[PDB]
UniProtKB/Swiss-Prot annotation, chain A:
Record function comment: This protein is one of the early assembly proteins of the 50S ribosomal subunit, although it is not seen to bind rRNA by itself. It is important during the early stages of 50S assembly.
Source organism, top-level taxon: Bacteria
Protein name per Swiss-Prot or TrEMBL: Large ribosomal subunit protein uL13
Species per Swiss-Prot/TrEMBL record: Mycolicibacterium smegmatis (strain ATCC 700084 / mc(2)155)
BP GO annotations: negative regulation of translation; translation
Entries under InterPro entries matching the protein: Ribosomal_uL13, Ribosomal_uL13_bac-type, Ribosomal_uL13_sf
Gene name of the encoded protein: rplM
Pfam family, one: Ribosomal_L13
Curated annotation (Swiss-Prot), chain B:
Gene name as annotated: rplT
HAMAP family membership: Ribosomal_bL20
PANTHER family linked: 39S RIBOSOMAL PROTEIN L20 (PTHR10986)
Assigned keywords, A-Z: Ribonucleoprotein, Ribosomal protein, RNA-binding, rRNA-binding
Any one biological process term the GO annotation gives: translation
Species annotation: Mycolicibacterium smegmatis (strain ATCC 700084 / mc(2)155)
Protein's name according to its UniProt entry: Large ribosomal subunit protein bL20
Pfam families listed in its UniProt record: Ribosomal_L20 (PF00453)
From Swiss-Prot, chain C:
Family membership: Belongs to the bacterial ribosomal protein bL32 family.
GO annotation terms (biological process): translation
Keyword tags: Ribonucleoprotein, Ribosomal protein
Biased composition (Basic residues): 1-18
Record bears the keyword Protein biosynthesis: no
Name of the protein in its database record: Large ribosomal subunit protein bL32
Xref: HAMAP family: Ribosomal_bL32
GO molecular function, one term: structural constituent of ribosome
Stretches of the chain forming a coiled coil according to its record: none
GO cellular component entries: large ribosomal subunit
Keyword check for Ribonucleoprotein: yes
Pfam families: Ribosomal_L32p
Record gene name: rpmF
UniProt organism field: Mycolicibacterium smegmatis (strain ATCC 700084 / mc(2)155)
From Swiss-Prot, chain E:
Assembly mode: Part of the 50S ribosomal subunit. Contacts protein L20.
Stated role: This protein binds to 23S rRNA in the presence of protein L20.
SUPFAM superfamilies: L21p-like (SSF141091)
Protein name: Large ribosomal subunit protein bL21
Source organism per UniProt: Mycolicibacterium smegmatis (strain ATCC 700084 / mc(2)155)
InterPro entries per UniProt: bL21-like, bL21-like_sf, Ribosomal_bL21, Ribosomal_bL21_CS
Length: 146, 124, 54, 23, 100
RNA sequence: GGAGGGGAGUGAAAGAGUACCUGAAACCGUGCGCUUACAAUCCGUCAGAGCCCUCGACGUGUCGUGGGGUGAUGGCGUGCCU
RNA sequence: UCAAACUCCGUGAUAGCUGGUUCUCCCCGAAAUGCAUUUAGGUGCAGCGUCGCAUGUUUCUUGCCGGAGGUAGAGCUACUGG
RNA sequence: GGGGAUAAGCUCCGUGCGUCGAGAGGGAAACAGCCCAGAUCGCCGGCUAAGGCCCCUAAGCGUGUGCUAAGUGGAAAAGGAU
RNA sequence: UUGUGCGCCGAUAAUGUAGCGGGGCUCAAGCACACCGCCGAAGCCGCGGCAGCCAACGUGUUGGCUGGGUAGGGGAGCGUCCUGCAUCCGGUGAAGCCGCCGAGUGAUCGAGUGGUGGAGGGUGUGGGAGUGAGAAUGCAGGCAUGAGUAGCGAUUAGGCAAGU
């Protein structure tokens, strides 16, 4: 019958993306695709078999509209009146990694497997990374004609 | 004339409670609680028997599409092409090919490339 | 007040497993040529001949 | 107010075709 | 080396020896039966056109007729009083691909 | 200390001991295998990794027209009756 | 325990009222409307269901021909009124 | 169409109009009456409707020509405005 | 100055964003008009098994149509007890109970085998019913959760040595 990956089956890879003025949505959808594993033919939703992702120049992310300063990230401690919010600009100039992370985390399942996937997401505010000893494959986001 | 009722009940009790070895709590000990869960259980089995078809077909399609897109063609146009070419292989088996032998699948991809219309967005 | 439900097997046995006991930490004593095991709290009183050793 | 209006305006969706029960 | 047989309103990937279960065909345990084909593979290349595919046919041996798994149905609806019990085993016919 | 019990005995059998024909379920525990402490579960069902037991064809261990217990993880899913 | 004790008996009092009524499959399959009603939450008959016999397409649908209507609309020095 | 304020998920009538009742499944974020469609049982087979194809969610960050700068899209009036 | 297609302000509530389902989207993933494909249901088709109505034929075969279903009407059946009649097993171990392996479209079944156990049971045809319970703030007995928790019955108050 149909094929189901066993234990000694997975083959991993470390991909690396540039965020040089890429659109956040494109970038995040691509990363979600890769991490969840919708690009290999061995896909199975019960298994995590995607690929590690390394994002760089994440402080170069540029969005459209007034979303830099009219858009409001929110949180809530749980206490009363403990709703506190932030723009996107403030949040870049505080820590840029979180914008791209949360953007991607909303493009994944919020289940156990999703939590076990977020482990496979590494993001760095600069161009660099300590993960050169995996020789990361550059990914260039492309669109297939039909 | 007086008919004690013991046997005639014990029968179905034994049946049910044999069929609920794996359930967790009062669903695994007690007839009035396992009967209900048997109703729900057989029903959910029925429904899943009707729907695992769509489940597997979804799976097969995701595999096919990712394989193709790594060979730089979309799913929709692949199936347009095979329909045009009269090729008969179903999706379970296209997926099996994708897993095992990507070469043959790439050959089929190439067939569809050949057999598609020239101007796909034409008004024909 | 009064409970509302029949609190399950898991929870029941789980909390019930806190009602346990520990053993006193025992220590030898050379009680007149031979040896017996006694807590440390009572060691001197044993060596002086008060503890009822059965 | 709000609740009734959002009901009566969710009805103007596409998969309902302009109508819903209990408005 | 393998092929893809059509039968039962279904399809099955096969090669010689690969035992298979299908719907109830009409034969005796031990007899042989031929079958149509959709795809064939000799190594790397493919036979994918209908004329060649009608010219090729696979041959199989009926090992044994058989009965599938027992399937319990208890249709049910609530506040109503509607139970309906029912059961099923589907008849099968095990094939063994002799050659191609 | 005694209750009570272990041997030795009676007896066809003490899984017949004056709480005694048989001796169910709820219920109460002891061992053996799997599983469970980053997780939101009408408590199941469909797919299913992994481990453990078993039958059989073989070969120094090994897949199978298998079967059974557990079952990570994913999808679906709003108790029973009046 | 008292706006008329308690016990037995009549007595298995009676309730247009509430609840409850146990094994399986196969076929067909509703209604929530009308008149009346010390009557409006009940019931009787007609309505719609099925079973059996009888009558055989009489039912229904589409086309064509024949028939009355005073609705929408429009109209008013064509009446009654503004 | 009446009553009501030409308000009510209001109330009362009509209708070889519908569905629910007694009817699952798909879509509608969840949602008895809405749209599609009326479940003999099985299959790890195919084509379609309503709806939808950036990720979550299977399917198109589809083709062509123009508009939108308002996060309109993804509630709203009288009225105002190069 | 007319008519248009999208737009702006007016716009405004109380647990927490909160009038896209969320991320996010104008480098449209938004509106319109045409075009191409595709996904998608228990729908239709495809391969199989059962069933009801009718019809054709032959000593029960095939075919077409059909098969959601509550109140309810009709039809056909399993099971339990006692029995009339005929036969079968049974201290060389029945029943009953725990099972394992299997079966039936279902109520259910094992004259199929193991353990326990110790004397009645099965089969076919008919007869008759105290004839099938999951619910009645249902009855009787037994046992759980609460729980190894609250309490241990006053406002007088107990103690040390020795004793058996």
């Amino acid at each position: 019958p149909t094929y189901t990956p066993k234990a000694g089956d997975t083959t991993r890879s470390w991909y690396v993306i540039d965020a040089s003025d890429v659109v956040l949505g494109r970038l995040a959808s691509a990363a979600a695709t890769l991490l969840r594993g919708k690009h290999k033919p061995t896909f199975t939703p019960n298994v995590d078999g995607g690929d590690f992702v390394i994002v760089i120049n994440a402080d170069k992310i540029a969005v459209s509209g007034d979303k830099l300063t009219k858009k409001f990230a929110y949180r809530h401690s749980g206490y009363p009146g403990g709703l506190r919010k932030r723009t996107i600009g403030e949040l870049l100039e505080k820590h840029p990694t979180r914008v791209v992370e949360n953007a991607i985390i909303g493009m994944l399942p919020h289940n156990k497997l999703g939590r076990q996937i977020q482990k496979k997401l590494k993001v760095y505010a600069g161009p660099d990374h300590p993960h050169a000893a995996q020789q990361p494959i550059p990914f260039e986001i492309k669109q297939v004609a039909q | 004339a007086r008919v004690k009722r013991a046997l005639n009940a014990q029968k179905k009790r034994r049946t049910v409670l044999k069929a609920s070895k794996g359930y967790r709590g009062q669903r695994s000990r007690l007839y009035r609680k396992a009967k209900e869960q048997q109703l729900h259980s057989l029903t959910y089995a029925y429904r899943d028997r009707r729907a695992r078809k769509g489940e597997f077909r979804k799976l097969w399609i995701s595999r096919i599409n990712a394989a193709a897109r790594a060979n730089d063609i979309t799913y929709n146009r692949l199936i347009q092409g095979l329909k045009a070419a009269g090729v008969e292989v179903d999706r379970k088996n296209l997926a099996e090919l994708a897993v095992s032998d990507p070469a043959a699948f790439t050959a089929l991809v190439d067939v569809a490339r050949a057999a598609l219309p020239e101007d796909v967005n034409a008004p024909s | 007040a009064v409970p509302k439900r029949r609190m399950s097997r898991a929870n029941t046995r789980s909390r019930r497993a806190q009602w346990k006991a520990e053993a006193p930490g025992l220590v030898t004593v050379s009680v007149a040529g031979q040896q017996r095991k006694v807590p440390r709290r009572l060691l001197k009183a044993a060596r002086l001949g008060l503890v009822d050793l059965d | 107010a709000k609740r009734g209006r959002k009901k009566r305006d969710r009805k103007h969706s596409k998969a309902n075709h302009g109508k819903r029960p209990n408005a | 080396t393998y092929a893809i047989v059509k039968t039962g309103g279904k399809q099955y990937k096969v090669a010689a020896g690969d035992v298979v279960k299908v719907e109830k065909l009409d034969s005796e345990p031990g007899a042989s039966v031929s079958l149509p084909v959709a795809l064939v593979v000799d190594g790397a290349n493919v036979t994918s056109k209908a004329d060649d595919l009608a010219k090729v046919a696979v041959t199989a041996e009926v090992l044994e007729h058989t009965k599938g798994p027992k399937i319990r149905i208890h249709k049910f609806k609530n506040k109503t009083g509607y139970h309906k019990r029912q059961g099923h085993r589907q008849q099968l016919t095990v094939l063994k691909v002799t050659g191609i």
